[PDB]
C-alpha cells in the first residue's frame, strides 16, 4: 500500500495534466476530479444536454473508443479507467 | 441539470 492508487497510462496522464494535475501518480478521486475539469474547460458536454459528452475528435475519445458518452449511464468512461490506470 | 453537478455523483 501506498498514499497514491494508481498511475495513469501515456494518454491518460496527458488530458489530466491538460487539466491542471501535477505528477503522475494519483488517488482515483484526483483522476475522477481532474477528468470531470478536462471536459469542462475544454467543454465537451453538450451546453443544452449536460450529461451528454461528445469526446470525438479528442483524444479522450480515442480513449474510450467512443464519438460520445452519458454521465447518467458511465460504464465506458469506468471500462476506459480500469485499462488506462495502473494500479500501485 | 449541471455538468459537474451530475459529474461529482459519480463513484470511485
Redesign the interface.
Known amino acids: 500500500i501506498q498514499i497514491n492508487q494508481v498511475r495513469p497510462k501515456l494518454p491518460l496522464l496527458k488530458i489530466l495534466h491538460a487539466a491542471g494535475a501535477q505528477g503522475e501518480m494519483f488517488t482515483?478521486?484526483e483522476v475522477?476530479h481532474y477528468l470531470?475539469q478536462y471536459?469542462?474547460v475544454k467543454q465537451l458536454?453538450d451546453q443544452q444536454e449536460?450529461?451528454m459528452v461528445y469526446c470525438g475528435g479528442d483524444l479522450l475519445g480515442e480513449l474510450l473508443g467512443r464519438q460520445s458518452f452519458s454521465?447518467?449511464d458511465?460504464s465506458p468512461?469506468y471500462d476506459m479507467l480500469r485499462k488506462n490506470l495502473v494500479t500501485l | 441539470?449541471?455538468?459537474?453537478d451530475?459529474?461529482?455523483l459519480?463513484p470511485?
Not at chain 2, 441539470?1 to 459537474?4: D, I, K, M, Y
Request: aromatic share 14%; net charge positive.
Open positions: 482515483v478521486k475522477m470531470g471536459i469542462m458536454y449536460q450529461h454521465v447518467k458511465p468512461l | 441539470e449541471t455538468f459537474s451530475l459529474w461529482k459519480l470511485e
